[PDB]
Design a protein around this ligand. Structure first.
Ligand code: NAG
Ligand code: CA
Length: 441
C-alpha cells in the first residue's frame, strides 16, 4: 500500500518501513492535515510571538521577519512531557542572547501523541515537510541549506534525519537523545545517521536498554561526533523508571501511561545551556565511561576537546564528559596530584583551586592512610574555569591523641584544555579541617 501527499511525495509500507522484524507493523504516515505541522518562526526582532511559515507558500517568508543573510535553526521536538511545551521557544530565546538568527520551531504534537508505531511513521511526513520548507527557501530565495541546522530531540531527531536525507548539502543536524525503537538496525534511510548532513552531532542521555530499564534513547553512535554526558544512560538529578520486562510504548506516547522523561529530556537541557556556555562542556574521547571515570582519558588530546552541544561544530570516536545535576550543568575538569607531608594519619585529603577568574569548592582527592612522602591523584569536575591558577588550598578531615598535622609539600594541577602542568608547594602542615595554602613553585 502507498499514500501520496501533495508536494511531499509518497510513502509506502514496504520494507524497511514495515514487514521486517524491527518494524513488523504495516502502518502508513498520517496526512499533513491530520498531523497539523506548524512552522513557528522566532527571530531577535520577534523573540516572543511567532510568525507562521508555510512551506507551500513563499509569501509567508516575505510576510515575516525571516532574514536571508542569517543562519536558520529549526527546532523539532519529539516526546513532550507535561510542563515542557515551551522548551523549543526557551531554546530559541537563548540563541537570541548570542546571535541574530531565524529560529523555526516545528510543532507536530498531534502527530506524535498517538501509538508509537504511528508516531514513528509520522516522522516520515514531518521530515518531508521540513525538506519541503528547505527546497522552497532554496528555490524562491536562493537560501542554501548549508546555512541551516536542524535540531531534533527524540523522535524529532529522525524527523531531522528524513529532512536531511531529502535535502542534499544540509549543513547540520544535531540529534538530542534520538529514540532507538523502530529505528536501530534499519537502512540509513529510516534513521538519523552521518549521511543526512555535512555535520551530524549527537547527544545521548537515556541510552539504557528499553527492556527492562525503560530507556528511550540509543547507545549506538549515530553521527560524526557522539557525546555521552555522564555515561549516556542515567543523568545526575534525574529519577529513573521502574524496571519491567513489559513496556507499554503505545500507552506512554498517547499519554496514558506514566513515564519518567527526565533522562530523555536532559539532552535538550544540556544543549540549551551550551548555547550560553561556549566552554562549559569539553568532551574527551575515551573507550568507555568507566575508563573516563577511572582517570584514563584526560587531559584533552593535542588538537583539543570538542564541546558537546551548540559549539560542537567548531571542532575539526565516543566522547565523554560530566555535567552538574541541576542548572548550569556546565563543568570544567581538572587533574591534581598531591604529594603528602607532615605525619601519618588516616583521612580524606581535599583540594580547592584559586585562580584569576575565581575558585572551586573543596574536592575529594584521596581517602585512606595519608602517609608523608606519598603521592595521590584524581580528576574532578568543578563549576567554573578558574582562569590562571594562582594558589591551591589543601584540607584533610580525619577518620589521634597526638594531634597529627598533615600537609602537602607539592600539588601539581592540570586543566583539561591545556598542555602544561602547574606546580604549587608548601613546607607547612595543618591539623584536620584547617586550610593550608600552597603557592607557585
Ligand atoms: C518558487 O519557485 C518555483 C520553482 O522555480 C516556481 O514554480 C514558483 O512559482 C515560485 N513561487 C513563486 C511564488 O514565485
Ligand atoms: Ca538517514
Amino acid at each position: 500500500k502507498e499514500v501520496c501527499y501533495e508536494q511531499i511525495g509518497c510513502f509506502s509500507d514496504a520494507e524497511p518501513w514495515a514487514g521486517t522484524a524491527i518494524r513488523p507493523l504495516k502502518v502508513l504516515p498520517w496526512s499533513p492535515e491530520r498531523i497539523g505541522t506548524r512552522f513557528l518562526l522566532y527571530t531577535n526582532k520577534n523573540p516572543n510571538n511567532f510568525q507562521t511559515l508555510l512551506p507551500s507558500d513563499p509569501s509567508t517568508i516575505g510576510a515575516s521577519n525571516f532574514q536571508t543573510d542569517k543562519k536558520t535553526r529549526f527546532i523539532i521536538h519529539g516526546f513532550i512531557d507535561k510542563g515542557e511545551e515551551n522548551w523549543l521557544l526557551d531554546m530559541c530565546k537563548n540563541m537570541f542572547k548570542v546571535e541574530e538568527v531565524n529560529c523555526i520551531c516545528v510543532d507536530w504534537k498531534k502527530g506524535s501523541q498517538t501509538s508509537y508505531t504511528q508516531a514513528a511513521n509520522n516522522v516520515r511526513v514531518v521530515g518531508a515537510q521540513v525538506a519541503q520548507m528547505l527546497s522552497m527557501l532554496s528555490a524562491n530565495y536562493s537560501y542554501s541549506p548549508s546555512q541551516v541546522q536542524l535540531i531534533g530531540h527524540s523522535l524529532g531527531a529522525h524527523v531531522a534525519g528524513e529532512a536531511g536525507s531529502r535535502t542534499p548539502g544540509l549543513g547540520r543536524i544535531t540529534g538530542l537523545d534520538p529514540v532507538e525503537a523502530s529505528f536501530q538496525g534499519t537502512p540509513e534511510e529510516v534513521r538519523l545517521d552521518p549521511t543526512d548532513a555535512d555535520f551530524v552531532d549527537v547527544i545521548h542521555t537515556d541510552a539504557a536498554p528499553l527492556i527492562p530499564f525503560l530507556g528511550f534513547g540509543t547507545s549506538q553512535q549515530m553521527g560524526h561526533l557522539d557525546f555521552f554526558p555522564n555515561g549516556g544512560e542515567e543523568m545526575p538529578g534525574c529519577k529513573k523508571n521502574a524496571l519491567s520486562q513489559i513496556v507499554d510504548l503505545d500507552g506512554i506516547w498517547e499519554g496514558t501511561r506514566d513515564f519518567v522523561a527526565c533522562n530523555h529530556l536532559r539532552s535538550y537541557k544540556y544543549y540549551s545551556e551550551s548555547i550560553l556556555n561556549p566552554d562549559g562542556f569539553a568532551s574527551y574521547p575515551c573507550a568507555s565511561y568507566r575508563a573516563f571515570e577511572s582517570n584514563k582519558c584526560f587531559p584533552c588530546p593535542d588538537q583539543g576537546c570538542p564541546q558537546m552541544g551548540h559549539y560542537a561544530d567548531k571542532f575539526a570516536q565516543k566522547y565523554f564528559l560530566n555535567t552538574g545535576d541541576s542548572s548550569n550543568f556546565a563543568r570544567w575538569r581538572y587533574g591534581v596530584s598531591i604529594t603528602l607531608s607532615g605525619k601519618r594519619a588516616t583521612g580524606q585529603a581535599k583540594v580547592a583551586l584559586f585562580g584569576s577568574k575565581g575558585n572551586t569548592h573543596q574536592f575529594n582527592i584521596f581517602k585512606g592512610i595519608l602517609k608523608p612522602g606519598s603521592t595521590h591523584s584524581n580528576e574532578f569536575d568543578a563549576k567554573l574555569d578558574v582562569g590562571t591558577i594562582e594558589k591551591v588550598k589543601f584540607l584533610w578531615n580525619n577518620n589521634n591523641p597526638t594531634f597529627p598535622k598533615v600537609g602537602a609539600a607539592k600539588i601539581t594541577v592540570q586543566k583539561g584544555e591545556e598542555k602544561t602542568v602547574h606546580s604549587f608547594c608548601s613546607e607547612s602542615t595543618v591539623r584536620e579541617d584547617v586550610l593550608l595554602t600552597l603557592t607557585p613553585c
